Coordinates of C-alpha atoms in Angstrom, one line a residue:
Chain A
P1 CA 152.8 92.0 105.8
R2 CA 150.7 95.2 106.2
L3 CA 149.3 94.7 109.7
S4 CA 147.6 98.2 109.9
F5 CA 146.6 101.3 108.0
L6 CA 148.7 103.2 110.6
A7 CA 152.3 102.9 111.7
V8 CA 153.1 99.8 113.7
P9 CA 155.4 100.0 116.7
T10 CA 158.7 98.1 116.2
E11 CA 160.9 96.4 118.7
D12 CA 162.8 99.6 119.0
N13 CA 160.1 102.1 119.7
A14 CA 157.5 100.0 121.4
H15 CA 156.4 100.5 125.0
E16 CA 158.2 98.0 127.2
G17 CA 154.9 96.5 128.5
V18 CA 153.8 96.0 125.0
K19 CA 157.1 94.1 124.4
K20 CA 156.5 92.1 127.6
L21 CA 153.1 91.2 126.3
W22 CA 154.6 90.2 123.0
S23 CA 157.0 87.9 124.7
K24 CA 154.3 86.4 126.8
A25 CA 152.0 85.8 123.8
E26 CA 154.9 84.1 121.9
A27 CA 155.8 81.9 124.9
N28 CA 152.1 80.8 125.2
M29 CA 150.9 80.3 121.6
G30 CA 153.8 80.3 119.2
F31 CA 153.0 83.7 117.7
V32 CA 152.1 87.3 118.6
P33 CA 148.5 88.3 117.7
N34 CA 148.6 91.0 115.0
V35 CA 146.3 93.2 117.1
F36 CA 149.0 93.2 119.8
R37 CA 151.3 94.8 117.2
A38 CA 148.9 97.1 115.4
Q39 CA 146.7 98.6 118.2
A40 CA 149.7 99.0 120.5
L41 CA 150.9 102.2 118.7
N42 CA 149.4 104.1 121.7
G43 CA 151.0 102.1 124.5
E44 CA 149.2 102.9 127.7
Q45 CA 145.8 103.0 126.0
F46 CA 146.5 99.6 124.5
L47 CA 147.6 98.1 127.8
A48 CA 144.5 99.4 129.6
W49 CA 142.3 98.1 126.8
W50 CA 144.0 94.7 127.0
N51 CA 143.5 94.5 130.8
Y52 CA 139.8 95.1 130.4
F53 CA 139.3 92.9 127.3
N54 CA 141.3 90.0 128.7
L55 CA 139.4 90.1 132.0
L56 CA 136.0 90.3 130.2
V57 CA 136.4 87.8 127.4
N58 CA 139.2 85.3 128.3
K59 CA 139.5 85.1 132.1
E60 CA 137.0 83.4 134.4
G61 CA 133.6 85.0 134.8
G62 CA 129.9 84.5 134.9
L63 CA 129.8 83.1 131.4
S64 CA 131.7 80.1 129.9
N65 CA 134.4 80.8 127.2
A66 CA 132.2 79.0 124.7
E67 CA 129.3 81.4 125.3
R68 CA 131.5 84.5 125.1
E69 CA 133.0 83.2 121.8
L70 CA 129.5 82.5 120.5
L71 CA 128.6 86.1 121.2
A72 CA 131.9 87.3 119.6
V73 CA 131.3 85.3 116.5
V74 CA 127.7 86.5 116.0
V75 CA 128.7 90.1 116.5
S76 CA 131.8 89.9 114.3
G77 CA 129.7 88.3 111.5
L78 CA 127.1 91.0 111.7
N79 CA 129.6 93.9 111.6
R80 CA 131.7 92.0 109.0
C81 CA 135.0 92.2 110.8
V82 CA 137.5 89.8 109.3
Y83 CA 140.0 89.9 112.1
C84 CA 137.5 89.2 114.8
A85 CA 135.6 86.7 112.7
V86 CA 138.7 84.6 112.0
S87 CA 140.3 84.7 115.4
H88 CA 137.1 84.3 117.5
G89 CA 135.8 81.7 115.1
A90 CA 139.0 79.7 115.9
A91 CA 138.3 80.3 119.6
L92 CA 134.7 79.1 119.2
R93 CA 135.7 76.0 117.3
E94 CA 138.2 75.2 120.1
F95 CA 135.9 75.8 123.1
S96 CA 132.8 74.3 121.5
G97 CA 134.4 71.3 119.7
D98 CA 131.7 71.7 117.0
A99 CA 133.2 73.3 113.8
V100 CA 129.9 72.9 112.0
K101 CA 128.1 74.9 114.7
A102 CA 130.8 77.6 114.6
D103 CA 130.6 77.9 110.8
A104 CA 126.8 78.1 110.9
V105 CA 126.6 80.6 113.7
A106 CA 129.2 82.8 112.0
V107 CA 126.8 83.2 109.1
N108 CA 123.3 82.9 110.6
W109 CA 122.5 81.6 114.1
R110 CA 118.9 81.0 113.0
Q111 CA 120.2 78.3 110.7
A112 CA 122.3 76.5 113.3
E113 CA 121.2 73.9 115.8
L114 CA 121.4 75.9 119.0
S115 CA 120.0 75.4 122.5
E116 CA 117.3 77.7 123.6
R117 CA 119.7 79.6 125.7
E118 CA 122.1 80.0 122.8
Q119 CA 119.2 81.1 120.6
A120 CA 118.1 83.8 123.2
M121 CA 121.7 85.0 123.6
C122 CA 122.2 85.2 119.8
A123 CA 118.9 87.0 119.2
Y124 CA 119.8 89.5 121.9
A125 CA 123.3 90.0 120.5
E126 CA 121.9 90.6 117.0
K127 CA 119.4 93.1 118.3
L128 CA 122.0 95.0 120.4
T129 CA 124.4 95.1 117.5
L130 CA 122.0 96.1 114.7
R131 CA 119.3 98.2 116.6
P132 CA 120.8 99.5 119.8
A133 CA 118.2 102.3 120.1
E134 CA 115.4 99.7 120.4
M135 CA 116.5 97.9 123.5
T136 CA 113.8 97.5 126.2
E137 CA 113.6 95.8 129.5
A138 CA 111.4 93.1 128.0
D139 CA 114.4 92.0 125.8
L140 CA 115.9 90.6 129.0
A141 CA 113.0 88.1 129.5
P142 CA 114.4 85.3 127.3
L143 CA 117.8 85.6 128.9
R144 CA 116.3 85.2 132.3
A145 CA 114.2 82.3 131.0
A146 CA 117.5 80.6 130.0
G147 CA 118.8 80.9 133.6
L148 CA 121.1 83.8 133.2
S149 CA 121.7 85.7 136.5
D150 CA 121.9 89.5 136.5
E151 CA 125.7 89.2 136.7
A152 CA 125.8 87.0 133.7
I153 CA 123.5 89.3 131.8
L154 CA 125.8 92.3 132.6
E155 CA 128.7 90.2 131.4
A156 CA 126.9 89.2 128.2
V157 CA 125.9 92.8 127.5
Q158 CA 129.5 93.9 128.1
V159 CA 130.8 91.2 125.7
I160 CA 128.4 92.2 122.9
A161 CA 129.2 95.9 123.2
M162 CA 133.0 95.2 123.5
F163 CA 132.9 93.3 120.2
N164 CA 130.9 96.1 118.7
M165 CA 134.0 98.2 119.7
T166 CA 136.7 95.8 118.6
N167 CA 135.0 95.3 115.2
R168 CA 135.0 99.0 114.6
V169 CA 138.7 99.4 115.6
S170 CA 139.9 96.5 113.5
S171 CA 137.8 97.4 110.4
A172 CA 138.7 101.1 110.6
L173 CA 142.4 100.5 110.9
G174 CA 142.7 97.5 108.6
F175 CA 143.9 94.8 111.1
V176 CA 144.8 91.4 109.6
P177 CA 144.3 88.1 111.5
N178 CA 147.3 85.8 111.9
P179 CA 147.3 82.9 109.4
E180 CA 147.5 80.5 112.4
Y181 CA 143.9 81.3 113.3
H182 CA 142.6 79.9 110.0
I183 CA 143.8 76.4 110.7
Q184 CA 143.2 76.1 114.4
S185 CA 140.8 73.5 115.9
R186 CA 139.5 73.0 112.3
Chain B
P1 CA 119.2 65.1 110.2
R2 CA 116.4 67.5 109.3
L3 CA 117.1 68.5 105.7
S4 CA 114.0 70.7 105.2
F5 CA 111.1 72.6 106.7
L6 CA 109.0 70.8 104.1
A7 CA 108.5 67.2 103.1
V8 CA 111.5 65.5 101.5
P9 CA 111.1 63.1 98.6
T10 CA 111.9 59.5 99.3
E11 CA 113.4 56.9 96.9
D12 CA 109.8 55.7 96.4
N13 CA 108.0 58.9 95.4
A14 CA 110.8 60.9 93.9
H15 CA 110.8 62.0 90.3
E16 CA 112.8 59.4 88.2
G17 CA 115.0 62.2 86.9
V18 CA 115.5 63.3 90.5
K19 CA 116.6 59.8 91.2
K20 CA 118.9 59.8 88.2
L21 CA 120.5 63.1 89.5
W22 CA 120.9 61.6 92.9
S23 CA 122.8 58.8 91.2
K24 CA 125.2 61.2 89.4
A25 CA 125.8 63.1 92.7
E26 CA 126.7 59.9 94.5
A27 CA 128.8 58.8 91.5
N28 CA 130.8 62.1 91.4
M29 CA 131.1 63.2 95.0
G30 CA 130.4 60.2 97.2
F31 CA 127.2 61.8 98.6
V32 CA 124.0 63.6 97.5
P33 CA 123.9 67.4 98.1
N34 CA 121.2 68.1 100.6
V35 CA 119.7 70.7 98.3
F36 CA 119.2 67.9 95.7
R37 CA 117.1 66.1 98.4
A38 CA 115.2 69.0 99.9
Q39 CA 114.4 71.2 96.8
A40 CA 113.4 68.1 94.7
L41 CA 109.9 67.9 96.2
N42 CA 108.7 69.6 93.0
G43 CA 110.4 67.3 90.4
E44 CA 110.2 69.2 87.1
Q45 CA 110.8 72.6 88.6
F46 CA 113.9 71.3 90.5
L47 CA 115.2 69.6 87.3
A48 CA 114.8 72.8 85.2
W49 CA 116.4 74.9 88.0
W50 CA 119.3 72.5 88.2
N51 CA 119.8 72.6 84.4
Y52 CA 120.0 76.4 84.6
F53 CA 122.1 76.6 87.7
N54 CA 124.6 73.9 86.7
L55 CA 125.1 75.5 83.2
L56 CA 125.5 79.0 84.7
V57 CA 127.7 78.4 87.7
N58 CA 129.6 75.1 87.2
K59 CA 129.9 74.6 83.5
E60 CA 132.2 76.4 81.0
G61 CA 131.6 80.1 80.5
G62 CA 132.8 83.6 80.3
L63 CA 133.9 83.5 83.9
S64 CA 136.3 81.2 85.6
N65 CA 135.0 78.9 88.4
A66 CA 137.1 80.9 90.9
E67 CA 135.4 84.2 89.9
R68 CA 131.9 82.7 90.1
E69 CA 132.6 81.2 93.5
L70 CA 133.9 84.6 94.7
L71 CA 130.7 86.2 93.6
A72 CA 128.7 83.4 95.3
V73 CA 130.6 83.7 98.5
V74 CA 130.2 87.5 98.7
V75 CA 126.4 87.3 98.0
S76 CA 125.8 84.4 100.4
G77 CA 127.7 86.2 103.1
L78 CA 125.6 89.3 102.6
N79 CA 122.3 87.5 102.6
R80 CA 123.5 85.3 105.5
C81 CA 122.5 81.9 104.0
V82 CA 124.4 79.1 105.7
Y83 CA 124.0 76.4 103.1
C84 CA 125.4 78.5 100.2
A85 CA 128.0 80.1 102.4
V86 CA 129.4 76.7 103.4
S87 CA 129.2 74.9 100.1
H88 CA 130.4 77.7 97.9
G89 CA 133.1 78.5 100.4
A90 CA 134.4 75.0 100.0
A91 CA 134.2 75.5 96.2
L92 CA 136.0 78.8 96.4
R93 CA 138.8 77.3 98.6
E94 CA 139.1 74.6 95.9
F95 CA 139.2 76.8 92.9
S96 CA 141.3 79.6 94.3
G97 CA 143.7 77.5 96.4
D98 CA 143.7 80.4 99.0
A99 CA 141.8 79.5 102.1
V100 CA 142.8 82.8 103.8
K101 CA 141.3 84.8 100.8
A102 CA 138.2 82.7 100.8
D103 CA 137.6 83.2 104.6
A104 CA 138.3 87.0 104.2
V105 CA 135.9 87.4 101.3
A106 CA 133.2 85.4 103.1
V107 CA 133.1 88.2 105.7
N108 CA 134.2 91.4 104.0
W109 CA 135.9 91.6 100.6
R110 CA 137.2 95.0 101.6
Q111 CA 139.5 93.3 104.1
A112 CA 140.9 90.7 101.7
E113 CA 143.9 91.0 99.4
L114 CA 142.1 91.2 96.0
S115 CA 143.0 92.3 92.6
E116 CA 141.4 95.4 91.1
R117 CA 139.1 93.2 89.0
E118 CA 138.1 91.2 92.0
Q119 CA 137.5 94.4 93.9
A120 CA 135.3 95.7 91.1
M121 CA 133.3 92.5 90.9
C122 CA 132.8 92.3 94.7
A123 CA 131.7 95.9 95.0
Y124 CA 129.2 95.4 92.1
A125 CA 127.9 92.2 93.7
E126 CA 127.4 93.9 97.0
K127 CA 125.5 96.8 95.5
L128 CA 123.3 94.5 93.4
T129 CA 122.6 92.4 96.4
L130 CA 121.9 95.2 98.9
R131 CA 120.7 98.1 96.8
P132 CA 119.3 96.7 93.5
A133 CA 117.0 99.7 93.0
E134 CA 120.0 102.0 92.7
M135 CA 121.7 100.2 89.8
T136 CA 122.8 102.5 87.0
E137 CA 124.7 102.1 83.7
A138 CA 127.7 103.8 85.3
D139 CA 128.0 100.9 87.7
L140 CA 129.2 98.8 84.7
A141 CA 132.2 101.1 84.1
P142 CA 134.5 99.5 86.6
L143 CA 133.6 96.0 85.3
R144 CA 134.5 97.1 81.8
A145 CA 137.6 98.8 83.1
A146 CA 138.7 95.4 84.5
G147 CA 138.5 93.8 81.0
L148 CA 135.1 92.1 81.4
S149 CA 133.4 91.5 78.0
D150 CA 129.7 92.1 77.6
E151 CA 129.1 88.4 77.8
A152 CA 131.2 88.1 81.0
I153 CA 129.2 91.0 82.5
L154 CA 125.9 89.3 81.6
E155 CA 127.2 86.1 83.2
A156 CA 128.4 87.8 86.3
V157 CA 125.1 89.7 86.8
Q158 CA 123.3 86.3 86.2
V159 CA 125.5 84.7 88.9
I160 CA 124.9 87.5 91.5
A161 CA 121.1 87.4 90.9
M162 CA 121.0 83.6 90.9
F163 CA 122.7 83.4 94.3
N164 CA 120.3 86.1 95.5
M165 CA 117.6 83.5 94.5
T166 CA 119.2 80.4 96.0
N167 CA 120.1 82.2 99.3
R168 CA 116.4 83.0 99.7
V169 CA 115.2 79.5 98.8
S170 CA 117.6 77.8 101.2
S171 CA 117.1 80.2 104.0
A172 CA 113.3 80.2 103.8
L173 CA 113.0 76.4 103.7
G174 CA 115.8 75.6 106.2
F175 CA 118.3 73.7 104.0
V176 CA 121.3 72.3 105.8
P177 CA 124.7 71.9 104.1
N178 CA 126.3 68.5 104.0
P179 CA 129.0 68.0 106.6
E180 CA 131.5 67.1 103.9
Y181 CA 131.6 70.8 102.7
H182 CA 133.1 71.9 106.0
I183 CA 136.2 69.7 105.5
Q184 CA 136.7 70.2 101.7
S185 CA 139.9 72.0 100.6
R186 CA 140.5 73.4 104.1

């Protein structure tokens, strides 16, 4: 299938750290995420990007995985990125155990049954995605009312902005999510 | 479960024709669509609305069920109405047999594998939903290039506008899609 609008590195010409990541992804999930193939055309840039993204979104931090995937799903729905919508909706279904909530939040978090902290985080994510020029200090007040430390607030801001980046990369270059994501934790 | 922001008719005060429609919904699907409960507060208006909507979207016409559900899914994704997104995504998965295509079109039809006719219909639907003031006769040229008769074009315009209406009703009054839709044809 056509993974990208640009050339995709093959096993022959790929960076060897890209190939090591391919083998690790296949040992761990049964497939290689198509982003790992498409975006890896520039090897060292891709490896640095993956280092940062993996540390911020997947590894342990100030926010739970469920909260990060909630932010990811809201942002990807707003920017209308199919790759991130599908894959991180699968991730949110897995980490939350509530497929109904994931499906609702993917469309409109206002029409989901969310905690007050989830509501604050989703409103903040939507404002930062759609109207970045209008951010004020007062916008942090709900987040602090929900018990988010400054470290957690920095992490959440990073996640929202990082998905504003990945949405643009994937939509500009025509990335396609793996079929496996559609059936996961459904 | 809170089906509505307004009062919901009970079995005691519901219109009799509303109760008869509840009975066909239970006879045909095993449950009553939550819209049939919430929107039926005004009996005669709901019954006329259902007559029109059922004739236009579900019954036999110039467009296939799959094409109508494609239009519905695109419009509901653009207006971010959870009820219509979930229910007509189930319908589109059923009529198309392609869950991947349905998931992709729900987010961004540009990132789905669509025929040229589907592309024309989805671009037209997006323009009519987001920029209705900018519609021109020239916008009909791709639809006619895709082999759509004048009757089929009238039906498609009706479908797009009708979902621009139901999205607004369901989002304004807090309608909640039945859990069954999330599982259907997955």
